[PDB]
Structure 1
Amino acid sequence: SILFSSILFSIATFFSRILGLFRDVLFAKYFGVSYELDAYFIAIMFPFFLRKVFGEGAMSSAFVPLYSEKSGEEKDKFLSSVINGFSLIILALVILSYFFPELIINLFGAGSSHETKILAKKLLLITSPSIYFIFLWAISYSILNTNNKFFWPALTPSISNITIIIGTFLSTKYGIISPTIGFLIGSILMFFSIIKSIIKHKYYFTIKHFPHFLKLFFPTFMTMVVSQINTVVDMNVVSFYDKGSISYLQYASRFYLLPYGLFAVSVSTVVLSKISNDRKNFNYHLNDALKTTLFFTIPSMVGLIFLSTPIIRFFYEHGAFTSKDTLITSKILIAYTLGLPFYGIYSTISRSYHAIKNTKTPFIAATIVSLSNIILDIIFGLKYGPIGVALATSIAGIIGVLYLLFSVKTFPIKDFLKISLNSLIMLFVIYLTDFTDNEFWFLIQILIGILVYLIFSSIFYRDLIRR
């Protein structure tokens, strides 16, 4: 029982990590880089952006306290208010979307070609309704958060991936609309997966509590918008360059995002819970988290940059994804990957501040990062295209972390220097091993790099290991 629960949950988490990668592999094989996939991304970008905002707690942060302070029927009324109000908004937001699709389109792919915008308009007819099920999924999620802190809903998004993957398999019959339908159905099934939390409540035909809830919800919602806006800006900027730019950024983003989610984000969740449970030792916990992030993100970066082309070719260069796409996506991946350690630090510091209820400093950091990213998007995007946009993302990350480090005034410098030294030693060794051109050699280079890095980590952290 107890053992079963743990092993099943761990399997589900592992597969959750794998499914995004597999979906992008299938996109590469079945669509490659094309205006069609660009239009798909434009069509799914607004609902995806909203789900990303709500997953960071934009809904929970305002809903949970206002919901908990209420009692009896009023509680349900509050819930109903939230459901009704947003539904109304969403309804308007869908109706307008049907009549003025250019409004939605120009937010994410203003510069894309005519055929791309026509196809994206077509796909919005399928993706716009998913916003409704995404909002309801979010609300359900919050209600659960009163019952238990986090739990499985974190894995409910996996549902979406499965359906999209299924759609991709069927695309040989129908084309891009099959993955788009897959996206919509996935949204609906997410909502159904956690629907129990709302379906147990009585429905009231009211928006009694909605204005007050908006008064408390809008500030936090906008902070999260700013914190998540960089991807929208990057997408809309590169939309002005040749077709497939959006798709290139997505493909490179996958391999940026695996190590980021595994090394940075997880450390950040741990530190948030730790500091929230043990506030008075803020510094200690923060330092610990920082060290951990640096221990994994610096070598990863090095490795990923050195092996970016064989990695991209191994995972993507099949079917519709060509060697040209490999070249371009490799360069973009390098540009993104220069920023990995900085965004790791950034995430850790931001969530520590959140752990002590400081929203101002994280919001200022996010503002610096987004402003920097748009400025550098214009400049470097004009000079270098998509690669310039990715590089702008990395540099903006650096600036943000400089602000956060000066603000929090704590950092494990000694461990940073040790980790950097080990990473350069590792790089030297794998450079020596790069003497043969084989499509699978990079896997043994990964093993060699890991071994060297761990050897020198065990040398330089011998006292810690012993104790």
Structure 2
Amino acid sequence: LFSSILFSIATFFSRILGLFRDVLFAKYFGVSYELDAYFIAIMFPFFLRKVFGEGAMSSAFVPLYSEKSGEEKDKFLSSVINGFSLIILALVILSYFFPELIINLFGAGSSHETKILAKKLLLITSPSIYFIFLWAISYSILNTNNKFFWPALTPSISNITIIIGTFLSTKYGIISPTIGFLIGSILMFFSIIKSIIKHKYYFTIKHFPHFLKLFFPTFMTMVVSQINTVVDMNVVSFYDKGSISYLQYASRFYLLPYGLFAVSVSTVVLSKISNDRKNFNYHLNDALKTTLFFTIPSMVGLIFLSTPIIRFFYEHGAFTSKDTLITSKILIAYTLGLPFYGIYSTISRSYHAIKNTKTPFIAATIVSLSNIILDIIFGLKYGPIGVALATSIAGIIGVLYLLFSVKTFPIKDFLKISLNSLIMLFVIYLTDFTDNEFWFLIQILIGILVYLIFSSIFYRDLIRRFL
């Protein structure tokens, strides 16, 4: 368990480091066409990391690597590296000659000056793909040797190098964090290079067709399942300049309470279902109560305090009062979906825990199609706020489908949690007088205390049994 607590500390600071990276973007670049161009240029390697984070490489590499032995293991590894090196080299050369293909994938609607700059930055980011693939392969090898802690922290390397590049941007401009992104991908790979170079190199691609047969179907499935990322960005690119940047500032901050409250708090309770499948309904209700307990007060507090929170973190240097006003509205639009995505995540993973992949797949399809259609309608009409809202409404639709499916929900506890959250709201509203820029921190503490006090009143009998 000591490694589990250590990994939580490591994850917290890794999340905070990403937040600090964005804080510096706001200070050194604010919201601008030039940061739009940066995000366009990094989005393909970023997107590819996300897909490999869902297991796209390990899903095929692990079984085919582990089944082999002796120098057939080296020959398999060489086949994978050689085959991908060939494909990637071809596509980086094509990227140099036709950068508009990648640009128009993520920023088709962006202005002329944006696309020109993104072309220049893509010359630097496109090679990072090669080092991301190698990183993903080494990551898989480490996983087959039961190494999980340290490989999971290597993305922090890239955030440090981007941060350093952002500091140097006062001399070079936006190209400095772009170079930092490339160097980050190189050093991420070098941090775990030994797992690859301990193998003998073979001039062979013998096993590459075998590996592709198992890799590509799953890889494409994971591409499609993460596509809403691409659609969000491409739709907003048609709005005002800086729209891409607004969406990144708001969504990257929102992912902090999302990851904590909509997913992580309910994991332990959800873990029990696999071992105790015949009590599925009880355990699912238990997990849903936990999710609601955290997401409902968090949603209320975040929305009420969205402007002072954004101001505290982002409103420095080039990030203006106007930027705070807009980013805060986008954050509210996302935060309205927090409890719905919490419920969604809880029911979906509970289904997986009992080997039902069909119902989670249908729900995910509904959410994805809903999100695309609503992006078209609301995103083209209202820019980033419309895209954020579309994402939240899509989650509501997914929740309605899943609730009709499991036909269970802890209604009594939802009402108790909601009342405690509204009592909390009433109190924080009363403490809203000073307008000091740091007062929102005290209101968060007051809100937590009020919420837990009244939680203990309404759950007194339950606390006694636990205590």
Please, what TM-score do these two structures have when normalized by structure 1? Answer: 0.93
Q: How does 1:164-313 map to 2 (within 5 A)?
A: 164-267=162-265, 270=268, 274-275=272-273, 282-313=280-311
- Comparing 291-300 with 146-155, which one deviates more in the overlay? 146-155
Shift of 1:349: 3.1
Distance 1:150 1:38, change over 3 A: same
User: Can you list the C-alpha shifts for 1:88-124, whole angstroms capped at 9, x where unaligned?
Assistant: 2211221111111000001100000001000000000
In 2: Cα distance, 1:84 partner to 1:414 partner: 59
Distance 1:72 1:275, change over 3 A: farther
| Contiguous gaps of at least 5 residues in structure 1 | none
Shift of 1:365: 2.3
User: Can you list the C-alpha shifts for 1:104-163, whole angstroms capped at 9, x where unaligned?
Assistant: 001100000001000000000010111111111111111122222732222111111111
In 2: Cα distance, 1:19 partner to 1:256 partner: 15
| Contiguous gaps of at least 5 residues in structure 2 | none
- Comparing 357-366 with 190-199, which one deviates more in the overlay? 357-366
User: Can you list the C-alpha shifts for 1:329-384, whole angstroms capped at 9, x where unaligned?
Assistant: 11111011111122222233333444445444333322211211111111112332
In 1: Cα distance, 2:130 partner to 2:401 partner: 37
Shift of 1:457: 1.1
In 2: Cα distance, 1:272 partner to 1:212 partner: 36
Q: 2:270 touches 2:287 (CA, 8 Å); kept in 1?
A: no
Shift of 1:451: 1.0
In 2: Cα distance, 1:190 partner to 1:285 partner: 39
Shift of 1:317: 0.9
In 2: Cα distance, 1:283 partner to 1:145 partner: 34
In 2: Cα distance, 1:196 partner to 1:288 partner: 44
Q: 1:171 touches 1:178 (CA, 8 Å); kept in 2?
A: yes
Q: 1:302 touches 1:423 (CA, 8 Å); kept in 2?
A: yes
In 2: Cα distance, 1:237 partner to 1:307 partner: 28
- Comparing 95-104 with 151-160, which one deviates more in the overlay? 151-160
Aligned to 2:418: 420
Q: 2:374 touches 2:390 (CA, 8 Å); kept in 1?
A: yes
In 2: Cα distance, 1:409 partner to 1:59 partner: 36
Shift of 1:278: 5.7
Distance 1:249 1:359, change over 3 A: same
Q: 2:270 touches 2:283 (CA, 8 Å); kept in 1?
A: no
Distance 1:392 1:275, change over 3 A: same
User: Can you list the C-alpha shifts for 1:141-199, whole angstroms capped at 9, x where unaligned?
Assistant: 11122222732222111111111111101110111111001111111111111222222
Shift of 1:446: 1.0
Q: 1:226 touches 1:370 (CA, 8 Å); kept in 2?
A: no
Distance 1:17 1:412, change over 3 A: same
In 1: Cα distance, 2:200 partner to 2:289 partner: 49
Shift of 1:282: 4.8
Shift of 1:385: 1.9
Shift of 1:250: 0.7
- Comparing 291-300 with 166-175, which one deviates more in the overlay? 291-300
Distance 1:177 1:259, change over 3 A: same
Q: 1:271 touches 1:348 (CA, 8 Å); kept in 2?
A: no
Shift of 1:31: 0.2
Distance 1:414 1:216, change over 3 A: farther
SS at the partner of 2:230? Answer: helix
In 2: Cα distance, 1:268 partner to 1:148 partner: 25
- Comparing 280-289 with 171-180, which one deviates more in the overlay? 280-289
User: Can you list the C-alpha shifts for 1:202-233, whole angstroms capped at 9, x where unaligned?
Assistant: 22222222223222223322332233211211
Distance 1:185 1:300, change over 3 A: same
Q: 1:227 touches 1:363 (CA, 8 Å); kept in 2?
A: no
In 1: Cα distance, 2:437 partner to 2:312 partner: 7
Aligned to 1:465: 463
Distance 1:62 1:253, change over 3 A: same
- In angstroms, what is the RMSD of aligned CA positions? 2.2
Aligned to 2:431: 433
Q: 1:97 touches 1:103 (CA, 8 Å); kept in 2?
A: yes
SS at the partner of 2:103? Answer: helix
Distance 1:451 1:222, change over 3 A: same
Identity %: 100
In 1: Cα distance, 2:23 partner to 2:352 partner: 35
In 1: Cα distance, 2:77 partner to 2:15 partner: 32
In 1: Cα distance, 2:203 partner to 2:277 partner: 42
Distance 1:268 1:430, change over 3 A: closer
Distance 1:195 1:410, change over 3 A: farther
Distance 1:217 1:270, change over 3 A: farther
User: Can you list the C-alpha shifts for 1:233-260, whole angstroms capped at 9, x where unaligned?
Assistant: 1110010011000000011112211111
Shift of 1:435: 3.0
Distance 1:357 1:4, change over 3 A: closer
- Comparing 283-292 with 304-313, which one deviates more in the overlay? 283-292
SS at the partner of 2:442? Answer: helix
Q: 1:226 touches 1:366 (CA, 8 Å); kept in 2?
A: no
User: Can you list the C-alpha shifts for 1:373-423, whole angstroms capped at 9, x where unaligned?
Assistant: 111111112332211111001111111222233334443333322222211
In 1: Cα distance, 2:89 partner to 2:272 partner: 41
Distance 1:196 1:204, change over 3 A: same
In 2: Cα distance, 1:177 partner to 1:315 partner: 24
Distance 1:437 1:302, change over 3 A: same
Distance 1:8 1:364, change over 3 A: closer
- Comparing 254-263 with 390-399, which one deviates more in the overlay? 254-263
Q: 1:271 touches 1:352 (CA, 8 Å); kept in 2?
A: no
Q: 2:270 touches 2:284 (CA, 8 Å); kept in 1?
A: no
Q: 1:223 touches 1:363 (CA, 8 Å); kept in 2?
A: no
In 1: Cα distance, 2:170 partner to 2:275 partner: 51
Q: 1:291 touches 1:412 (CA, 8 Å); kept in 2?
A: yes
Distance 1:149 1:56, change over 3 A: farther
Shift of 1:17: 1.6
Q: 2:289 touches 2:410 (CA, 8 Å); kept in 1?
A: yes
In 1: Cα distance, 2:216 partner to 2:286 partner: 34
Q: 2:17 touches 2:159 (CA, 8 Å); kept in 1?
A: yes
Shift of 1:284: 4.8
- Comparing 133-142 with 199-208, which one deviates more in the overlay? 199-208
Distance 1:224 1:230, change over 3 A: same
SS at the partner of 1:281? Answer: helix
User: Can you list the C-alpha shifts for 1:65-110, whole angstroms capped at 9, x where unaligned?
Assistant: 2222223322222222222222222112211111110000011000
Distance 1:284 1:128, change over 3 A: farther
Q: 1:268 touches 1:351 (CA, 8 Å); kept in 2?
A: no
SS at the partner of 1:58? Answer: coil
In 2: Cα distance, 1:408 partner to 1:216 partner: 33
In 1: Cα distance, 2:396 partner to 2:60 partner: 31
Q: Which runs of 4+ in 1 moved over 6 A?
A: 3-7
- Comparing 192-201 with 91-100, which one deviates more in the overlay? 192-201
